[PDB]
Amino acid sequence: QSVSRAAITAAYRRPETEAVSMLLEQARLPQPVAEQAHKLAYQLADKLRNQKNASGRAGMVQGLLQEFSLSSQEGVALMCLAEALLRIPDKATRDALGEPLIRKGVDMAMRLMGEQFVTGETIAEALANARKLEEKGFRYSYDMLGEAALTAADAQAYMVSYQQAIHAIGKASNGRGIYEGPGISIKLSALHPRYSRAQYDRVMEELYPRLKSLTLLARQYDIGINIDAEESDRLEISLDLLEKLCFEPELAGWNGIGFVIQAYQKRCPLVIDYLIDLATRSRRRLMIRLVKGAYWDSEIKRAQMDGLEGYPVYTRKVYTDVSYLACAKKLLAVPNLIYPQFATHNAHTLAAIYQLAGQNYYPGQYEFQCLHGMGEPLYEQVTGKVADGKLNRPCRISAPVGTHETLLAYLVRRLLENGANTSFVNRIADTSLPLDELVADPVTAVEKLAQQEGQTGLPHPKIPLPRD
Amino acid sequence: QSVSRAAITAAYRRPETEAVSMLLEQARLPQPVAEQAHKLAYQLADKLRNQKNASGRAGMVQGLLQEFSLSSQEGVALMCLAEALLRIPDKATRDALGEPLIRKGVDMAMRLMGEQFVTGETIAEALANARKLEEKGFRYSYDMLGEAALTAADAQAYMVSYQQAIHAIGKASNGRGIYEGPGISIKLSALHPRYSRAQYDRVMEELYPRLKSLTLLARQYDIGINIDAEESDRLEISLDLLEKLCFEPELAGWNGIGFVIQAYQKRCPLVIDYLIDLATRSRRRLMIRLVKGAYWDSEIKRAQMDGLEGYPVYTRKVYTDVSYLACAKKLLAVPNLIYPQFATHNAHTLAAIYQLAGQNYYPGQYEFQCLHGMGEPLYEQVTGKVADGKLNRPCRISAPVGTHETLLAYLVRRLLENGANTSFVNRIADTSLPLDELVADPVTAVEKLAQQEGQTGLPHPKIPLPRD
Ligand SMILES: Cc1cc2nc3c(=O)[nH]c(=O)nc-3n(C[C@H](O)[C@H](O)[C@H](O)COP(=O)(O)OP(=O)(O)OC[C@@H]3O[C@@H](n4cnc5c(N)ncnc54)[C@H](O)[C@@H]3O)c2cc1C
Ligand SMILES: Cc1cc2nc3c(=O)[nH]c(=O)nc-3n(C[C@H](O)[C@H](O)[C@H](O)COP(=O)(O)OP(=O)(O)OC[C@@H]3O[C@@H](n4cnc5c(N)ncnc54)[C@H](O)[C@@H]3O)c2cc1C
Ligand code: PRO
Ligand code: PRO
């Protein structure tokens, strides 16, 4: 292994106290930036939570809930009475006065809950919905749903669907290019049967030609093509496929190759070192999507079943936040080698990146990204003209495309993300949680914990090492 | 009285069978137009009701509500189970498994329900919220809340507030003119103490100088100034004030004077004849807002208490719809004399006007109008580029401005409008009412009734003549 590859391998499951301790100073926002990040986060979160005055309206209630000392069911009864009285037109009059059931229930609940996250059933239908937000400065990346191909036929169907999508998106793009125009994202698990346990030689012989073919096609249309990151035990093979791809003669001089890295992995900073080296050696700018990570629940369960030395991911959410900030700094440092794409729905994460990116923004410096159905509310404050009170930073929406038959795995990941009490999108709905706690700085949070617990970066109390 | 004024007076309370019979053929859409109106209405209503697939989602439910023959509380219990099961991260595991209380209650319920209809507490705050929709082709008219001045001081305060608003809107308009730029609306009841019973000589001596002053000021900024229509027994005096205003030398050649007429009045078509004559004599194009009418409940109660020969308004909602269509045709016929502004939230009314207005639309031919908090959803399909799937017709939003202390009377009118089972905005929420019934043609509805009941335009069965 190369120096940078060896360093990745060695960091696979290193102890959390150690990993978190190393990240801390790399993630720390310089005091001035910290404060600007705080103010911007607070404001973003305020406008988002209180768009329709959901807090000021709670305040008006409690103001009467005390002046009369009434209960919940009490105050409501009064409002109904007041409503009925307001429907009196004249003021004077008002004044004077088996298993299939279960199998189907799950299918239906998935489809009902899933609609909000799907852009369209077909690529043409998704493209049709693009202009509305593209006219406002948003960009799109299309995500053909369907993964973990089980058969050769499965993988073939996915391959054909991706090709068709690229032709369609590429015709829609119409020369707009990899930054300003739409792109596509692909899952390697979709292109090779039984990817989860696939061996190196079969992946190269079979998966790679498909990856190359799609990438050449994307390049012909000059659209971005991004490789999604999946389970942690596929990181290594994904790097081998990326390595090989970046040295294809037909791809020389083209900067449309994109790759996701997951901040919840202890390996993330080390993967960045490798990528910086790869960009240098292959003479290109890589489009790098920095994400926190979508498979956390399964990663913990997987590690606990394999009874290994440790976890490949962090066990406290705040450590993932710290990792993301440290990694973001590393990416922003090398604008000649990387085009960073900062995927987040978290107002603080967004504000911190906005500040870390420094003065003198230019369009091709970086972009934000979000998931359809989750990020638009927040990024409506961000993408757009400064005169209209926006930040004038581009956001690319990831737009799932497919029918109910391909929706399951993606939906479950969205359920987990939205429903977790640690998630920003969950906590911002909790009007009992003060904005300041919601946008609290992750580094300072970690230092608080370290003081209270006796050392930095201890694992989650409820998540012991697999061997315990 | 002039011929046209005499004809108004004589129509004040004419029998509904007679009034409705006269309107019917004036309102009838020529067969071809009728069908295009139907298709457009249907489509507008479909997109509005089913924006987030609220009907297709009901269809998916009932499809299982039968395949298992489960009740409402039953199906829900299943969805919760299916939701909990979808939160299992791994598929294998999932598979294997006193009076102040009342006085305050009314105040609070008003403010809570009222927020959705108010644009801002102050004119500057309302103006600040303009760009978002003005950038999309919407226009605004600002409605300083507060009416029925009881004292001389009250009316003075309203006068001062209107003046300040005109300066602010006029500075915001910045030369955009009466069609493309924002304007203001005023209530005469706000400018004169105890307007409801005010005598002709005192109104002219006191109200008129204030009306003139505001209109001259509006003209200096070249912004529209619209006179709201209020209770029916103030129609006559409002016409006298308008008559006088239109002959002011300082207003000669200026077409920014606006005036509301209420289609639910039997007098409406006759008022149009008068207005057409007034525009001719005073040598101007009048901005005429055709509305159905906001005071129906009070009008019925007022007439029943005065025990007069009949009602000044129709007693069936469908007759008001017919009156509006007939009046709309009359207005569209005289583009040199009137700039018609068609206020409606009703998809059929809108579609019918769109068709009646004929081929070869030009911006200054007419506009649509709506109330803030009620019309934007519908007009998002209407105002905008044809390429984006819109109708490319302008809509002017009426935007209430003021604090909770001025909100009461307006809110009650909105409660009545929204809550009435006869209102389009109520029925469109009723997913059990088929789109075709919702957008049913009013003339054909009236003819159906006439066949079933034995004659055309009979009063509402539940609303006898006041003397019964
Ligand atoms: C355009 C786009 C593309 C994406 N592509 C991928 C992809 O290819 N692969 C993928 O894995 N994800 C991908 N993601 C999504 C992603 O990783 C999640 O949306 C994300 O982790 C949420 O981060 P957040 O800052 O919005 O929310 P935040 O609420 O700030 O953080 C949320 C989360 O932190 C983590 N976490 C939660 N609990 C813990 C814990 N106890 N210990 C340690 N970490 C914890 C998680 O990673 C998690 O989702 C993509 C997202 C977008 C917007
Ligand atoms: C910009 C703007 C300015 C306005 N200015 C005024 C104004 O100065 N004065 C004013 O009075 N209104 C005014 N209105 C509002 C108005 O009159 C109501 O919003 C309106 O009547 C609703 O009509 P619609 O076509 O949207 O709804 P629809 O549901 O199609 O019709 C609604 C209604 O029909 C009528 N109605 C209801 N029941 C009956 C019945 N049993 N018999 C006969 N008629 C019935 C009513 O007039 C009523 O509101 C204005 C509205 C707007 C948008
Ligand atoms: O599949 C997922 O969950 C993430 C989110 C978009 C694609 N990668
Ligand atoms: O006051 C009302 O109710 C109507 C609606 C806007 C102004 N005239």
PDB file of C-alpha atoms in Angstrom, chain A residues 134-288:
ATOM      1  CA  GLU A 134     -33.016  25.938 -10.885  1.00  0.00           C
ATOM      2  CA  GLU A 135     -34.438  29.369 -11.733  1.00  0.00           C
ATOM      3  CA  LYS A 136     -33.634  30.373  -8.159  1.00  0.00           C
ATOM      4  CA  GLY A 137     -30.011  29.220  -8.272  1.00  0.00           C
ATOM      5  CA  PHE A 138     -30.454  25.659  -7.042  1.00  0.00           C
ATOM      6  CA  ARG A 139     -28.747  22.797  -8.809  1.00  0.00           C
ATOM      7  CA  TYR A 140     -29.647  19.091  -8.965  1.00  0.00           C
ATOM      8  CA  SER A 141     -28.045  15.690  -8.744  1.00  0.00           C
ATOM      9  CA  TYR A 142     -30.267  12.760  -9.785  1.00  0.00           C
ATOM     10  CA  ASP A 143     -30.249   9.623  -7.650  1.00  0.00           C
ATOM     11  CA  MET A 144     -31.768   6.628  -9.440  1.00  0.00           C
ATOM     12  CA  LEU A 145     -33.169   4.622  -6.501  1.00  0.00           C
ATOM     13  CA  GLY A 146     -32.237   0.950  -6.305  1.00  0.00           C
ATOM     14  CA  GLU A 147     -29.243  -0.692  -4.701  1.00  0.00           C
ATOM     15  CA  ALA A 148     -27.665  -3.923  -3.483  1.00  0.00           C
ATOM     16  CA  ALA A 149     -28.287  -5.794  -6.758  1.00  0.00           C
ATOM     17  CA  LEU A 150     -28.835  -9.434  -5.881  1.00  0.00           C
ATOM     18  CA  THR A 151     -28.636 -10.958  -9.353  1.00  0.00           C
ATOM     19  CA  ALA A 152     -26.815 -10.434 -12.640  1.00  0.00           C
ATOM     20  CA  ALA A 153     -30.131  -9.380 -14.157  1.00  0.00           C
ATOM     21  CA  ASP A 154     -30.706  -6.864 -11.341  1.00  0.00           C
ATOM     22  CA  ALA A 155     -27.351  -5.184 -11.938  1.00  0.00           C
ATOM     23  CA  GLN A 156     -27.932  -5.122 -15.687  1.00  0.00           C
ATOM     24  CA  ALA A 157     -31.266  -3.368 -15.229  1.00  0.00           C
ATOM     25  CA  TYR A 158     -29.635  -0.774 -12.968  1.00  0.00           C
ATOM     26  CA  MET A 159     -26.860  -0.278 -15.533  1.00  0.00           C
ATOM     27  CA  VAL A 160     -29.406   0.322 -18.293  1.00  0.00           C
ATOM     28  CA  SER A 161     -31.397   2.711 -16.112  1.00  0.00           C
ATOM     29  CA  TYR A 162     -28.277   4.789 -15.285  1.00  0.00           C
ATOM     30  CA  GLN A 163     -27.357   5.055 -18.999  1.00  0.00           C
ATOM     31  CA  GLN A 164     -30.818   6.249 -19.933  1.00  0.00           C
ATOM     32  CA  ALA A 165     -30.723   8.750 -17.029  1.00  0.00           C
ATOM     33  CA  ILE A 166     -27.378  10.125 -18.201  1.00  0.00           C
ATOM     34  CA  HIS A 167     -28.674  10.699 -21.752  1.00  0.00           C
ATOM     35  CA  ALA A 168     -31.752  12.453 -20.315  1.00  0.00           C
ATOM     36  CA  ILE A 169     -29.905  14.599 -17.762  1.00  0.00           C
ATOM     37  CA  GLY A 170     -27.174  15.346 -20.288  1.00  0.00           C
ATOM     38  CA  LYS A 171     -29.741  16.548 -22.824  1.00  0.00           C
ATOM     39  CA  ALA A 172     -31.374  18.633 -20.099  1.00  0.00           C
ATOM     40  CA  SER A 173     -28.005  20.039 -19.003  1.00  0.00           C
ATOM     41  CA  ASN A 174     -27.294  21.106 -22.596  1.00  0.00           C
ATOM     42  CA  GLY A 175     -23.701  22.201 -22.047  1.00  0.00           C
ATOM     43  CA  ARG A 176     -24.201  23.907 -18.671  1.00  0.00           C
ATOM     44  CA  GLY A 177     -21.223  21.932 -17.357  1.00  0.00           C
ATOM     45  CA  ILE A 178     -20.383  20.072 -14.156  1.00  0.00           C
ATOM     46  CA  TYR A 179     -20.733  23.005 -11.762  1.00  0.00           C
ATOM     47  CA  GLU A 180     -23.824  24.846 -12.997  1.00  0.00           C
ATOM     48  CA  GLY A 181     -25.656  22.001 -14.677  1.00  0.00           C
ATOM     49  CA  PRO A 182     -27.341  18.891 -13.233  1.00  0.00           C
ATOM     50  CA  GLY A 183     -25.411  15.695 -12.600  1.00  0.00           C
ATOM     51  CA  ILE A 184     -26.068  12.110 -11.581  1.00  0.00           C
ATOM     52  CA  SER A 185     -25.124   9.897  -8.632  1.00  0.00           C
ATOM     53  CA  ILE A 186     -24.578   6.152  -8.706  1.00  0.00           C
ATOM     54  CA  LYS A 187     -24.218   3.337  -6.175  1.00  0.00           C
ATOM     55  CA  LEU A 188     -21.570   0.714  -6.879  1.00  0.00           C
ATOM     56  CA  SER A 189     -23.739  -1.861  -5.042  1.00  0.00           C
ATOM     57  CA  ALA A 190     -26.226  -1.407  -7.881  1.00  0.00           C
ATOM     58  CA  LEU A 191     -23.754  -2.324 -10.639  1.00  0.00           C
ATOM     59  CA  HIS A 192     -22.465  -5.638  -9.322  1.00  0.00           C
ATOM     60  CA  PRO A 193     -24.373  -8.709  -8.015  1.00  0.00           C
ATOM     61  CA  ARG A 194     -23.890  -9.313  -4.297  1.00  0.00           C
ATOM     62  CA  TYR A 195     -21.506  -6.343  -3.959  1.00  0.00           C
ATOM     63  CA  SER A 196     -21.565  -6.701  -0.157  1.00  0.00           C
ATOM     64  CA  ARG A 197     -19.236  -9.703  -0.268  1.00  0.00           C
ATOM     65  CA  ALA A 198     -17.716  -9.215  -3.737  1.00  0.00           C
ATOM     66  CA  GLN A 199     -14.043 -10.095  -4.248  1.00  0.00           C
ATOM     67  CA  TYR A 200     -11.451  -7.700  -5.701  1.00  0.00           C
ATOM     68  CA  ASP A 201     -10.819  -9.589  -8.963  1.00  0.00           C
ATOM     69  CA  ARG A 202     -14.488  -9.981  -9.889  1.00  0.00           C
ATOM     70  CA  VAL A 203     -15.235  -6.337  -9.023  1.00  0.00           C
ATOM     71  CA  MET A 204     -12.440  -5.111 -11.330  1.00  0.00           C
ATOM     72  CA  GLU A 205     -13.332  -7.537 -14.110  1.00  0.00           C
ATOM     73  CA  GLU A 206     -17.051  -6.757 -14.012  1.00  0.00           C
ATOM     74  CA  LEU A 207     -17.978  -3.677 -12.026  1.00  0.00           C
ATOM     75  CA  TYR A 208     -15.199  -1.432 -13.261  1.00  0.00           C
ATOM     76  CA  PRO A 209     -16.006  -1.680 -16.969  1.00  0.00           C
ATOM     77  CA  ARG A 210     -19.541  -0.533 -16.089  1.00  0.00           C
ATOM     78  CA  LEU A 211     -18.297   2.323 -13.902  1.00  0.00           C
ATOM     79  CA  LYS A 212     -15.898   3.445 -16.662  1.00  0.00           C
ATOM     80  CA  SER A 213     -18.600   3.240 -19.349  1.00  0.00           C
ATOM     81  CA  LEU A 214     -21.016   5.427 -17.362  1.00  0.00           C
ATOM     82  CA  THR A 215     -18.268   7.914 -16.549  1.00  0.00           C
ATOM     83  CA  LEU A 216     -17.232   8.244 -20.215  1.00  0.00           C
ATOM     84  CA  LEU A 217     -20.877   8.820 -21.109  1.00  0.00           C
ATOM     85  CA  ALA A 218     -21.268  11.467 -18.387  1.00  0.00           C
ATOM     86  CA  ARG A 219     -18.160  13.137 -19.717  1.00  0.00           C
ATOM     87  CA  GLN A 220     -19.578  13.252 -23.262  1.00  0.00           C
ATOM     88  CA  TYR A 221     -22.459  15.327 -21.911  1.00  0.00           C
ATOM     89  CA  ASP A 222     -20.132  17.206 -19.542  1.00  0.00           C
ATOM     90  CA  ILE A 223     -22.220  16.354 -16.466  1.00  0.00           C
ATOM     91  CA  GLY A 224     -21.001  15.471 -12.972  1.00  0.00           C
ATOM     92  CA  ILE A 225     -20.962  11.786 -12.034  1.00  0.00           C
ATOM     93  CA  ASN A 226     -20.759  11.063  -8.320  1.00  0.00           C
ATOM     94  CA  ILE A 227     -19.934   7.756  -6.611  1.00  0.00           C
ATOM     95  CA  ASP A 228     -22.091   7.332  -3.461  1.00  0.00           C
ATOM     96  CA  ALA A 229     -20.501   5.978  -0.296  1.00  0.00           C
ATOM     97  CA  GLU A 230     -22.230   2.935   1.237  1.00  0.00           C
ATOM     98  CA  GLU A 231     -21.282   0.496   4.023  1.00  0.00           C
ATOM     99  CA  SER A 232     -17.862   0.944   5.642  1.00  0.00           C
ATOM    100  CA  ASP A 233     -16.469  -2.418   4.556  1.00  0.00           C
ATOM    101  CA  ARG A 234     -16.789  -1.293   0.940  1.00  0.00           C
ATOM    102  CA  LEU A 235     -14.657   1.858   1.418  1.00  0.00           C
ATOM    103  CA  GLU A 236     -11.435   0.123   0.376  1.00  0.00           C
ATOM    104  CA  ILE A 237     -12.766  -1.389  -2.835  1.00  0.00           C
ATOM    105  CA  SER A 238     -14.415   1.926  -3.739  1.00  0.00           C
ATOM    106  CA  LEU A 239     -10.985   3.622  -3.496  1.00  0.00           C
ATOM    107  CA  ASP A 240      -9.410   1.001  -5.806  1.00  0.00           C
ATOM    108  CA  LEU A 241     -12.157   1.618  -8.374  1.00  0.00           C
ATOM    109  CA  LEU A 242     -11.710   5.389  -8.073  1.00  0.00           C
ATOM    110  CA  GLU A 243      -7.927   5.136  -8.362  1.00  0.00           C
ATOM    111  CA  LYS A 244      -8.236   3.189 -11.614  1.00  0.00           C
ATOM    112  CA  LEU A 245     -10.928   5.457 -13.025  1.00  0.00           C
ATOM    113  CA  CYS A 246      -8.901   8.653 -12.498  1.00  0.00           C
ATOM    114  CA  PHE A 247      -6.083   7.345 -14.709  1.00  0.00           C
ATOM    115  CA  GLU A 248      -8.240   6.524 -17.737  1.00  0.00           C
ATOM    116  CA  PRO A 249      -6.745   8.304 -20.790  1.00  0.00           C
ATOM    117  CA  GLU A 250     -10.240   9.176 -22.065  1.00  0.00           C
ATOM    118  CA  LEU A 251     -10.927  10.989 -18.787  1.00  0.00           C
ATOM    119  CA  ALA A 252      -7.704  13.009 -18.793  1.00  0.00           C
ATOM    120  CA  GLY A 253      -8.280  16.720 -18.179  1.00  0.00           C
ATOM    121  CA  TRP A 254     -11.902  16.171 -17.140  1.00  0.00           C
ATOM    122  CA  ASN A 255     -12.958  17.200 -13.593  1.00  0.00           C
ATOM    123  CA  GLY A 256     -16.454  15.731 -13.470  1.00  0.00           C
ATOM    124  CA  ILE A 257     -15.621  12.674 -11.338  1.00  0.00           C
ATOM    125  CA  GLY A 258     -17.291  12.944  -7.924  1.00  0.00           C
ATOM    126  CA  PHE A 259     -16.887  10.881  -4.760  1.00  0.00           C
ATOM    127  CA  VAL A 260     -18.648  10.855  -1.357  1.00  0.00           C
ATOM    128  CA  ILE A 261     -16.699  10.602   1.898  1.00  0.00           C
ATOM    129  CA  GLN A 262     -18.428   9.955   5.241  1.00  0.00           C
ATOM    130  CA  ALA A 263     -17.334  12.093   8.235  1.00  0.00           C
ATOM    131  CA  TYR A 264     -18.690   9.581  10.781  1.00  0.00           C
ATOM    132  CA  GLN A 265     -15.832   7.262   9.847  1.00  0.00           C
ATOM    133  CA  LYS A 266     -12.599   7.404  11.768  1.00  0.00           C
ATOM    134  CA  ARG A 267     -10.892   6.940   8.396  1.00  0.00           C
ATOM    135  CA  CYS A 268     -12.308  10.117   6.856  1.00  0.00           C
ATOM    136  CA  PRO A 269      -9.361  12.532   7.371  1.00  0.00           C
ATOM    137  CA  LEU A 270      -7.008   9.808   6.110  1.00  0.00           C
ATOM    138  CA  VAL A 271      -9.157   9.270   2.998  1.00  0.00           C
ATOM    139  CA  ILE A 272      -8.871  13.021   2.327  1.00  0.00           C
ATOM    140  CA  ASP A 273      -5.059  12.754   2.469  1.00  0.00           C
ATOM    141  CA  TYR A 274      -5.307   9.940  -0.093  1.00  0.00           C
ATOM    142  CA  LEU A 275      -7.698  11.925  -2.305  1.00  0.00           C
ATOM    143  CA  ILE A 276      -5.466  15.007  -2.261  1.00  0.00           C
ATOM    144  CA  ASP A 277      -2.624  12.762  -3.426  1.00  0.00           C
ATOM    145  CA  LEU A 278      -4.820  11.102  -6.050  1.00  0.00           C
ATOM    146  CA  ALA A 279      -5.912  14.470  -7.472  1.00  0.00           C
ATOM    147  CA  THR A 280      -2.273  15.487  -7.702  1.00  0.00           C
ATOM    148  CA  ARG A 281      -1.113  12.282  -9.377  1.00  0.00           C
ATOM    149  CA  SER A 282      -4.033  11.998 -11.804  1.00  0.00           C
ATOM    150  CA  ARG A 283      -3.877  15.733 -12.571  1.00  0.00           C
ATOM    151  CA  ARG A 284      -7.502  16.677 -11.848  1.00  0.00           C
ATOM    152  CA  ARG A 285      -9.885  18.521  -9.524  1.00  0.00           C
ATOM    153  CA  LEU A 286     -12.126  15.965  -7.783  1.00  0.00           C
ATOM    154  CA  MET A 287     -15.712  16.790  -6.826  1.00  0.00           C
ATOM    155  CA  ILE A 288     -15.857  15.646  -3.214  1.00  0.00           C
TER     156      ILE A 288
END
